[PDB]
Structure formats: structure tokens, C-alpha cells
């Protein structure tokens, strides 16, 4: 639902089988929290994968300079 840093997902899709299922699929990603900011100290964001790995090449700061600004 979140993965805040990055968008998210929760888009639907149909999970076909052998030929076809007109069913539906959805909810993905995950969560976690408690991220230590070099500054004061951690607010627990509920990012997920692709969100967690993002806080790496990036920052922790710029990775937050948005969930604030905008």
C-alpha cells in the first residue's frame, strides 16, 4: 500500500492457469520500518523492496527530502 519512497502497486491482474483463469491478483510489496537517520534519529517509514534498496544508492536524507517537501 505504501513503500512510500517509491510509488507502490496494488494493481490488479488476472492469474491465468493452463489456458485460462478469469480470476484476479493484486496486493504486493511489503513493509518494514525503523530507519536510523544520521541526523537526530529514526522515524519509522514503511517502505518495502525497491524502496529499501533505493535508500542505498541514494541517501536516507534525499530519500526523505520528498516525503516532506511534496
Amino acid at each position: 500500500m505504501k513503500k512510500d519512497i517509491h510509488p507502490k502497486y496494488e494493481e490488479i491482474t488476472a492469474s491465468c492457469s493452463c489456458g485460462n483463469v478469469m480470476k484476479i491478483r493484486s496486493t504486493v510489496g511489503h513493509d518494514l520500518n525503523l530507519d536510523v537517520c544520521s541526523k537526530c534519529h529514526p522515524f519509522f517509514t514503511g517502505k518495502q523492496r525497491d524502496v529499501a534498496t533505493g535508500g542505498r544508492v541514494d541517501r536516507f536524507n534525499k530519500r526523505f527530502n520528498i516525503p516532506g517537501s511534496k
Binding site: 536510523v36 544520521s38 542505498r56 544508492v57
Partner: protein
């Protein structure tokens, strides 16, 4: 797989590894409170300009914290009875306080966060050994004893 410890800690690197390091290990421990690392351009080059003012520690800082085992060893016997009783046991709680607080029985003070004793101390009265563990770099020695009252 790329960090810069600088403050080596049993890790296969000192002064900060510039080559393949461990990963995910630092995301939550090493980096936080421990030894920040980001071996990413920015932080990297900044390590070059270093580290005399930062290295003077092993020479100076170590000294301003190594005299520990020397400043406190000849210490007069620690006479802090831990309420020895119970037909041969005790009442006083021997854990962290009496160990360290056994120094300001005259004035000097320390920090309870430096004790070195894996097992909790059996509530005895004998020569309670207290291996003062101020810093990894320097260890000290203290004692504790219980009396009857």
C-alpha cells in the same frame, strides 16, 4: 559490498575497506551509531583529505583513556558489603551498581556501562573480581568484597 569502516572492528578491514566489503550487515548496526561507511564517491574522496586530526586519537585519545587500568588498580579494597546473610547467602543485589559505584566511596565516578563479566556475579562475599572494561583498546582491573553487618 562497499563501505569504509576506518574504525576497524574484527572486520576484514581497517581505516576503512576500499574493496568489496560485506553488505546488508551495515544497513542496520554498522552504519547506525557504529562506524558510518557509504563508500560512494562523495564520502570516498573525503576520506583522502584525512585523517591526521582523526588519527591523533590512537596516540592522544587512546592515552586520555588508557590510564584506566593504571589509575585504578592499587585501589583500596572495595568494602561494599552486599548484605551477606540468609544462613550463608546474601540480601544485597550484586549486578551493575555496586561494581562501578564502588569508586565514589571517596569521590571519583565511573560509568556502569564498562563492566566486564559475562555471567552475573554469584551473590557471594568473596573476592568479587571486576575486570573494568572501559574501552576495547584498554581494560582495567577492579575488585569487590562483601562484609557482614
Amino acid at each position: 559490498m562497499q563501505v569504509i569502516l576506518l574504525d576497524k572492528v574484527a572486520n576484514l578491514g581497517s581505516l576503512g575497506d576500499q574493496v568489496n566489503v560485506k553488505a546488508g550487515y551495515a544497513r542496520n548496526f554498522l552504519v547506525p551509531q557504529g562506524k558510518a561507511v557509504p563508500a560512494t564517491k562523495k564520502n570516498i574522496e573525503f576520506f583522502e583529505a584525512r585523517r591526521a586530526e582523526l588519527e591523533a586519537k590512537l596516540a592522544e585519545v587512546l592515552a586520555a583513556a588508557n590510564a584506566r587500568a593504571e589509575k585504578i588498580n592499587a585501589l583500596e579494597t572495595v568494602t561494599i558489603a552486599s548484605k551477606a546473610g540468609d544462613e550463608g547467602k546474601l540480601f544485597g543485589s550484586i549486578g551493575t551498581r555496586d561494581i562501578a559505584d564502588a569508586v565514589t566511596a571517596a569521590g571519583v565516578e565511573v560509568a556502569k556501562s564498562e563492566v566486564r563479566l559475562p555471567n552475573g556475579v554469584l551473590r557471594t562475599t568473596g573476592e568479587h573480581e571486576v575486570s573494568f572494561q572501559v574501552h576495547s583498546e584498554v581494560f582495567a582491573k577492579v575488585i569487590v568484597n562483601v562484609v557482614a553487618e
